[PDB]
Design an enzyme around this catalytic site. Structure first.
Site: not given
Ligand SMILES: N=C(N)c1ccc2c(c1)[C@@H](c1ccccc1)C[C@@H](c1cc(N)cc(-c3ccccc3C(=O)O)c1)N2
Ligand SMILES: [Ca+2]
Lengths: 55, 254
Positions: B186, B192-193
């Site tokens: 995953d 993110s982004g």
């Molecule tokens: N499984 C996936 N493909 C996946 C991909 C990206 C994300 C998730 C999951 C969520 C998640 C949920 C629980 C645990 C782990 C991941 C969290 C969500 C997010 C949202 C916000 N508002 C801030 C941050 C965030 C906070 C700190 C550092 C970096 C980031 C960053 O933006 O990556 C991250 N982004």
């Protein structure tokens, strides 16, 4: 025509009045005389990986 | 990225690294010499708008090899429909202060036309997701850019498969699922982004943005990606327009 296998276009497809179809390319590409293929017109066209292209 | 591999240097040349005060913030995707697409949620906590930097040609965070190009981010454009602290309409369009110079290591990913993306790209099974994010859920981030091949799922299939877990949020028309439900592979926090890039007849296109999910590589769950095809016209209109003062801009959507 564009609905079925992208109208045969390598990139973009436009349907025209009747059985007419025009393929188009993204900027940095030109359409070949086959009317379907796109060839780069720049050194770094989008979506191509130079280290792999040069390989 | 969880369960992927190091992206060989120069093989994800559109990958962007976003920095705030020199610290890793998020990923992004170069779509031409001055525009980067990222996730709106990455900008929810910025106060330091003047110290937002985009790095192109990056590969290994521990060494400067000379292929890296840094640019200040002059503007961050977010759709009016995006609500901070939420996951929906998770896209941002960034204008760089000055263009990056295209090289073997810095190349844009093609932003496709809407109809081509919806009727052709959406049916390409596998796509590449990449980033310097966490290598494991609750783990350390990567020093070298990582890449992962993920299959796309129809939202109904994702919903029925993604277990009846309390407060399991809605997967809207502005999102799509991709990945694996077996807990192996995953994208993760820090990715993110970043791009979800799709190959079609010898060219790569932008079809998704790493957005959210329930943890990383959690059993019964998939990664959730912004459905970029919904935003093509919105992005194209903004790119054809003159810059406005102020770093953050909210632009009406549609
Ligand atoms: N499984 C996936 N493909 C996946 C991909 C990206 C994300 C998730 C999951 C969520 C998640 C949920 C629980 C645990 C782990 C991941 C969290 C969500 C997010 C949202 C916000 N508002 C801030 C941050 C965030 C906070 C700190 C550092 C970096 C980031 C960053 O933006 O990556 C991250 N982004
Ligand atoms: Ca480096």
């Amino acid at each position: 025509i564009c609905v079925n296998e992208n109208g045969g276009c390598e990139q973009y497809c436009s349907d025209h009045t009747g059985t007419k179809r025009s393929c188009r390319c993204h900027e940095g590409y030109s359409l070949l005389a086959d009317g379907v293929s796109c060839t780069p017109t720049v050194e770094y066209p989008c979506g191509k990986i130079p280290i792999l292209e040069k390989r | 990225i969880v369960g992927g591999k190091v992206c060989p240097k120069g093989e994800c040349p559109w990958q962007v690294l976003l920095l705030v005060n020199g610290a890793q913030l998020c990923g992004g995707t170069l779509i031409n010499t001055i525009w980067v697409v990222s996730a709106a949620h990455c900008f929810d906590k910025i106060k330091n708008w003047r110290n937002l930097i985009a790095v192109l040609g990056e590969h290994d965070l521990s060494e400067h090899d000379g292929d890296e190009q840094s640019r200040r981010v002059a503007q961050v454009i977010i759709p009016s429909t995006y609500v901070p602290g939420t996951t929906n309409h998770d896209i941002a369009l960034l204008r760089l202060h000055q263009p990056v110079v295209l090289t073997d290591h810095v190349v844009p990913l093609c932003l496709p036309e809407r109809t081509f993306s919806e009727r052709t790209l959406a049916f390409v099974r596998f796509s590449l997701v990449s980033g310097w994010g966490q290598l494991l859920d609750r783990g350390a981030t990567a020093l070298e850019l990582m890449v992962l091949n993920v299959p796309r799922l129809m939202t109904q299939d994702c919903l029925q498969q993604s277990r009846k877990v309390g407060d399991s949020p809605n997967i809207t028309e502005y999102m799509f699922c991709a990945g694996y439900s077996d807990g192996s592979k995953d994208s993760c926090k820090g990715d993110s982004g970043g791009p979800h890039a799709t190959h079609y007849r010898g060219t790569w296109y932008l079809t998704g943005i790493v957005s959210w999910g329930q943890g990383c590589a959690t059993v019964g769950h998939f990664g959730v990606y912004t459905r970029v095809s919904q935003y093509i016209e919105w992005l194209q209109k903004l790119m054809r327009s003159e810059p406005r003062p102020g770093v953050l801009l909210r632009a009406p959507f549609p």
